[PDB]
Design a protein around this ligand. Sequence first.
Ligand SMILES: NC(=O)c1ccc(OCC2CCCCC2)cc1
Lengths: 198, 195
Amino acid sequence: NLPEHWTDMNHQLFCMVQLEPGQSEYNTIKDKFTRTCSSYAIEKIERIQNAFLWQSYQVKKRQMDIKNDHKNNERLLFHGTDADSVPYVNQHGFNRSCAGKNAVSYGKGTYFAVDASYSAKDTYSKPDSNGRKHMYVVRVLTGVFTKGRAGLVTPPPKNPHNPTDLFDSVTNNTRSPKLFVVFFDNQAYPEYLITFTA
Amino acid sequence: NLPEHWTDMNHQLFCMVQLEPGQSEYNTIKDKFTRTCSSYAIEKIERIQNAFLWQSYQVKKRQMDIKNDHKNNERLLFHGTDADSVPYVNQHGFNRSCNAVSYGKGTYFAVDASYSAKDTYSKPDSNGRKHMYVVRVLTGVFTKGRAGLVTPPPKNPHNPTDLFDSVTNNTRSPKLFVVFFDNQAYPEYLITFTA
Ligand SMILES: NC(=O)c1ccc(OCC2CCCCC2)cc1
């Protein structure tokens, strides 16, 4: 059930795995980050191996793939957060109940950025006492999306006469999406933690 | 792995199935309600067959059974709600983001149907129709709740991420439980009733 290239956790449910520079797995994340954050420097990249979060996320992905009748439902996005939140996110993922109000709100949910530069703002990846900034790389089930609105506590219906048949996520702009908001647990898998500095 | 007692859905993933009165299943669910709501009038009882919600719930159950190293994590509880919320709950289950929240910002479930039968929860529509779910809830290991909780407290302040599974008003003699995560509750039956 767990991915075959994960480290053997021998009966453990959770591990953070430090990646090596020069491995394709490290370099792809570094390249994705540096595309918009070349003024910052990466300290380390850790692969998050969380068996329970993976299981629940992969069930939601299978369900969305069935429902939407295509496999274009997942995006790899960024999430900047404070040092105090990292232990919780590593273990329990992204909790909308703990989410900050975004400077431009498209709904009351968890925000994920297309560009690492957005998540790199001190407002999100708050520097800790040692000047370390923290950004997740996240598999997000964006699915079918529409432009959000500040009042949303769930994605809006696709059709106002069928209020329970929802968009999967919302965005700031459907033609040029730069942020996505999700409103349900296990719709986002924290896959890598980037620790970085100025 | 859909439950044996579900009825065939012709390759669909969601069905509300009206129960036959006088058959074992209807009688069992009716008895749980009449223990405390014998003065009410039951119009019908529906089995909620929601394959996706069941799947996500059973994954959480298996995880909680592993974490707690036992299978005593599930309780059958009641949830009263308004008619306008019923379609949402049938399809999507319980959402903490959707009354007093004295034990935390989660979804509330009653031990007694009589508590859920209060008009504040099971709001009567035009014709006096009231709605109450019978819910499978992963209460697991619980502690006393308090106002402002967004998740259950930690079991020990020394491991802040190892949480209680739910909170209650009273650990010795609980009358309500609050859960704070999606897919910790499966709406199993919908009772439509009047006072
Ligand atoms: N929807 C329901 O059925 C339900 C709703 C609320 C509930 O307890 C809430 C109160 C909060 C103040 C102290 C006593 C308990 C139990 C069940």
